[PDB]
Structure 1
Amino acid sequence: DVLPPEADSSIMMLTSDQKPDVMYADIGGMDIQKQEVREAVELPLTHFELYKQIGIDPPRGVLMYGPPG
């Protein structure tokens, strides 16, 4: 047999989706930049079809090298 679930094999958090904890604009940090982050969410926000045709190469990995600020 093969187990379909994979997240609970070593825990390490699970599906945090479908749950509004902190929506978006309710953050106190406003932007810092948050435009590269919205650029990061462009791929989840569909737009992968717009990644082609328009000829862009959307970013894949986003590293935030900041303190707990």
Structure 2
Amino acid sequence: DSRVKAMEVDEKPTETYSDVGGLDKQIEELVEAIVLPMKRADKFKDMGIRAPKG
């Protein structure tokens, strides 16, 4: 459908997670939840854990 094709990436410029003042710990947990079970999907498969759905 045409609403979903617009929702698709358009490359929004990053603001960078280092320019977001304070809140050090919140960046790590977010990185733990979304970014690292995509890239390192071998170490979840050796261990035998599932990836957090969201």
Corresponding residue to 1:15 among 9, 26, 30: 9
State the aligned residue count.
51
Larger displacement relative to structure 2 (34-43 or 23-32): 23-32
**Does the 8 Å contact 2:17/2:27 carry over to 1?**
no
Q: 2: CA distance between counterparts of 1:57 and 1:43?
A: 9
Gap runs ≥5 in structure 2: none
TM-score of the aligned structures, taking structure 2 as reference length: 0.60
> Judging changes above 3 Å, is the alpha-carbon distance between structure 1 residues 29 and 16 closer, same or farther for their aligned structure 2 residues?
farther
Give the alignment's TM-score, normalised by structure 1.
Answer: 0.51
Higher alpha-carbon Rg: 1
- Bigger helix fraction: 2
Helix, strand or coil for the counterpart of 1:43?
A: helix
What is the letter of the counterpart of residue 50 of structure 1?
K
> Bigger relative contact order, structure 1 or 2, given CA contacts below 8 A and separation 6+?
2
**Which amino acid counterpart does residue 15 of structure 2 have in structure 1?**
V
Percentage of identical aligned residues? 37
What amino acid sits opposite 2:32 in the alignment?
E
Distance 1:14 1:37, change over 3 A: same
